[PDB]
Each structure stands twice: as C-alpha cells, then as structure tokens.
Design a protein around this ligand. Structure first.
Ligand SMILES: NC(=O)[C@H]1CCCN(C(=O)Cc2ccnc(Cl)n2)C1
Ligand SMILES: [Zn+2]
Length: 139
C-alpha cells in the first residue's frame, strides 16, 4: 500500500484505489496502473522533474529503503494477475530489488523529489510506475 499526496491530489496504484478514490476521480489509466483522486487537505509531497535513473525506494515487506538503478519509462509486458489481463504496461521502470504484491505503493525518490510508485515485481525485479511526466500534478 501507499500514495503520493501533492497539492490537492492523491496518486495511488489504480488496482488498489478505494471507493472514495473513484468517487473523487480526477484521472486514471489502466495501461499505467495509476489513479489520481482529489483531496480536501494540502499534500506533503513534491514531484521530481528530471531524468534521474538512480534513486531510493521504500520496501514495506522489509521495512527498509533500498538504493536502485532503474530503466527509463517504457512499455513492458506484464503477466495476467487477479487485477489485470496479460498486457503491456506503459511508463514502467524496472530495477533489481526485492518486492512482494503488498509492496505496491512504496515511493521511489531521487534528490529532486518523488519519481514514482512500486507497481510490479517478482524474481528479484521491482517495477515502478513513473509520475514525472504528469506536469499537471503541480499546476
Ligand atoms: N501493475 C500490475 O499489473 C500489477 C498488479 C498487481 C499484481 N502484479 C504484480 O506484479 C504483483 C507483485 C509481485 C511482486 N512484487 C510486486 Cl510489487 N507486485 C502486477
Ligand atoms: Zn532526479
């Protein structure tokens, strides 16, 4: 679990969005596993606007942060799960690191701010849904 709170927006994994997220929907994209909902309170986070390919992510299944080198956002095949059919997930970045299903929502940060959230993983890989191109989150 986990979310990014920026301005009057809450960014979550689309497959983990609650009834309240869908009732306050701003934007969602099944191909990116992202959903953004509106909030009444001002958020605590800031979004990176950069091309970093190194950063640190929070891994809830280890209660620890790990440093990672990650690939640029791209279209990557993701096998079928209870949440989605087999498909290509866009704007996804992979890195070598530990993750389990409940780790989705953990934040990946670089020196400039939030880069994205854990969205996929397995066999010593961890995939992050990028949010750096969503310029409207700040404006
Ligand atoms: N974005 C998706 O299609 C995911 C939806 C939930 C299921 N899924 C996974 O990858 C599950 C999983 C295993 C190990 N580590 C992590 Cl962070 N997630 C795929
Ligand atoms: Zn950066």
């Amino acid at each position: 679990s986990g979310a990014i709170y920026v301005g009057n927006y809450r960014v979550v994994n689309r497959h983990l969005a609650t009834h309240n997220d869908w009732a306050n929907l701003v934007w969602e994209d099944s191909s990116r596993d992202l959903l953004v909902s509106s909030t009444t309170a001002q958020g605590c986070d800031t979004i990176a606007r950069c091309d970093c390919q190194t950063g640190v992510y929070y891994c809830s299944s280890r209660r620890k942060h790990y440093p990672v080198s990650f690939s640029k956002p791209s279209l990557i095949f993701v096998e079928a799960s209870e949440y989605y059919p087999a498909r290509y997930q866009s704007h996804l970045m992979l890195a070598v690191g530990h993750s389990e299903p409940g780790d989705c929502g953990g934040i990946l940060r670089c020196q400039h701010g939030v880069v994205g959230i854990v969205s996929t993983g397995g066999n010593g890989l961890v995939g992050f849904a990028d949010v750096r191109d969503l310029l409207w989150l700040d404006e």
